[PDB]
Structure formats: C-alpha cells, structure tokens
Amino acid sequence: NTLAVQGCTGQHGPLATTFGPVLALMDNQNNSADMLNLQTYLTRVTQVRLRLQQIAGSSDPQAMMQLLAQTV
Amino acid sequence: TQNSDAMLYQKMLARVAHQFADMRLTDMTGDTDVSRLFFTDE
C-alpha cells in the first residue's frame, strides 16, 4: 500500500518506468497482461499454508508428512 | 426539407451524445475485480 500511493505523485505519471512492473501488480486495470498479479499469489501461498496445517495437525507416526511429499 | 418522427429523434441524440462518455465493464460492478473473469468488448 505504501508503494502504491507513491507511484502517482505528480498527476499515468512521470515516474512510470521506475515503478512500472511493481505498480502493474495491484491495479486490476492490467486488462491484458496475462494477469500475473499480487492478489492471486497470496491465495496461491495460503493453500501451501493450508495443506501444511494438516501436517501441523496430527503427523502422528511422522508419516502423513511424507504422504503430502510423496506427491512431490 | 421535412422533419417528422425521424430527424426528431436524430436531433435528440446529437445533442445528448455531447455530454456522457461510454460505460465500460470496469465502471460497472462498482470496484470489484472483473478483469479476472470477463474480457468484454463492444
């Protein structure tokens, strides 16, 4: 957020090419960029957290830890 | 040299089309992320 508002000083702005790709993430006005953005990534990492919560759950014989790793 | 029910509606439009701009997809739906769903044109 702090990086978001500083990419609009001046008046899209005069600091375009220095904050180009990083402000190309959060905008949702990147209507053809292959959508490549920040917001999907944090849900793309919350499920690697979530399937690791089950290993942080039981993990009783130290198996069912590698059962998620047997998929890898 | 005549004007009845046809040039009437045309002169309605060519004065009102001055004011308002087009309405895209993104100024619909309020604020929400629509670019992840619909790549609408026209």
Q: 3-state class of A34 per DSSP? A: coil
Resolution of this structure in Å: 4.0
Cα A14 to Cα A7, A26, A61, distances in angstroms: 9, 19, 60
Amino acid in the structure at residue B26? T
What sign results for the dihedral spanned by CA atoms A13, B21, A26, A32?
negative
Structure tokens that stand for B5 in this block: 């029910």
Q: How far apart are the CA of A42 and the nearest CA of chain B, in angstroms?
A: 15
Token match 């979530």: residue?
A: A50
Structure tokens that stand for B12 in this block: 């309605």
Report d(CA B32, CA A58) in Å as an integer.
Answer: 39
CB contact at 8 A, A17 and A29? no
Q: 3-state class of A39 per DSSP? A: helix
Phi, psi of A39 (to 5 degrees): -70, -35
Q: How was this entry determined?
A: cryo-EM
Between B26, B36, B39, which is nearest A29 by CB? B26
Best residue in B35, B37, B38 for a mutation probing chain A (most A CBs within 10 Å): B35
Structure tokens that stand for B35 in this block: 């670019």
